[PDB]
Design a protein around this ligand. Structure first.
Ligand code: HEM
Ligand code: HEM
Ligand SMILES: Oc1c(Br)cc(Br)cc1Br
Ligand SMILES: Oc1c(Br)cc(Br)cc1Br
Lengths: 137, 137
């Protein structure tokens, strides 16, 4: 289930973080505009840039913390607030987060590995509601 | 489902509230010691008391609001805090609530009406967790 999925992802965090992030950018290419230093760079070029592996792992580490602190896929409002008031997220809307979770779920469903993808979808919906409540447009 | 069950209970609140609260007191007769003048009385006696129906309606009125404000059967922390801080609940521990929800779930399973009894069980467990988080012993 969802708790096992957190363990699966954490076990190989750098690989899953990179693969899911690239799945997100591939499905929604116009989203790459928010990551100016990744424009025009192939996947292998990205993975040789220190900040790409660092960014992505840290993003997914925080996502996994928020996921682990949730109850029945309902995140803490305090965690939603952290995400909204990060300077790096200042120009985002809940739609950018909905896109990430659509890509993450699609990726889970397409993988060899046995994810509770319904629960990630629900977590994503609950997180979007909470981001909105914490002031994200 | 859970959401509709809230509407079902609200639609015949004083009847369901008395029936469920009676199921609780009959399953756990020692729980009458937190209340005044309940011992030594049959169900019909209790239901003709001045205060029994009124008190018990007020309990279920609030229980249904807590359930309605929940997401995925997870109550709000502010609702848990209210229940912990109420002067009328100063003698209570989370075990008292656990027992109430066990009886409530067992009433729903036995009833002729189509309740989502698994969701009420989850809600009760999540409420006990939230009461603990809010500092109830
Ligand atoms: C739950 C979802 C997300 C979590 C947990 C999250 C977490 C983070 C974290 C922890 C950082 C800082 C990393 C660092 O400084 O090394 C960050 C940076 C950033 N995030 Fe988010 N993020 C989320 C969703 C998004 C989405 C949906 C977008 C855009 C579509 C976005 C765009 C950015 C950008 C542009 C940066 C700056 C790049 C960097 O220096 O790391 N993030 N994210
Ligand atoms: C979600 C569960 C519960 C809710 C929403 C709740 C709500 C309330 C409310 C609104 C009152 C005020 C009633 C009034 O003054 O008319 C109350 C009183 C009280 N409650 Fe709770 N309650 C809950 C669980 C419990 C449990 C598990 C116990 C004990 C086993 C308990 C014991 C009392 C007592 C002793 C009073 C005052 C005496 C009385 O009303 O007869 N309640 N409850
Ligand atoms: O910050 C994130 C982004 Br941007 C995309 C995906 Br997919 C996951 C996270 Br966390
Ligand atoms: O009002 C309640 C009483 Br009195 C006991 C249990 Br257990 C649960 C509720 Br709600």
């Amino acid at each position: 289930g969802f708790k096992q999925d957190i363990a699966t992802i954490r076990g190989d965090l750098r690989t899953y973080a990179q693969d899911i992030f690239l799945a997100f950018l591939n499905k929604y290419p116009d989203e790459r505009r928010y990551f100016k230093n990744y424009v025009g760079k192939s996947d292998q070029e990205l993975k040789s840039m220190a900040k790409f592996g660092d960014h992505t792992e840290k993003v997914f580490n925080l996502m996994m913390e928020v996921a682990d602190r949730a109850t029945d896929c309902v995140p803490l409002a305090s965690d939603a607030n952290t995400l909204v008031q990060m300077k790096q997220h200042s120009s985002l809307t809940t739609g950018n987060f909905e896109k990430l979770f659509v890509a993450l779920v699609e990726y889970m469903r397409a993988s060899g590995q046995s994810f509770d993808s319904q629960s990630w979808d629900r977590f994503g919906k609950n997180l979007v509601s909470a981001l909105s409540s914490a002031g994200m447009k």
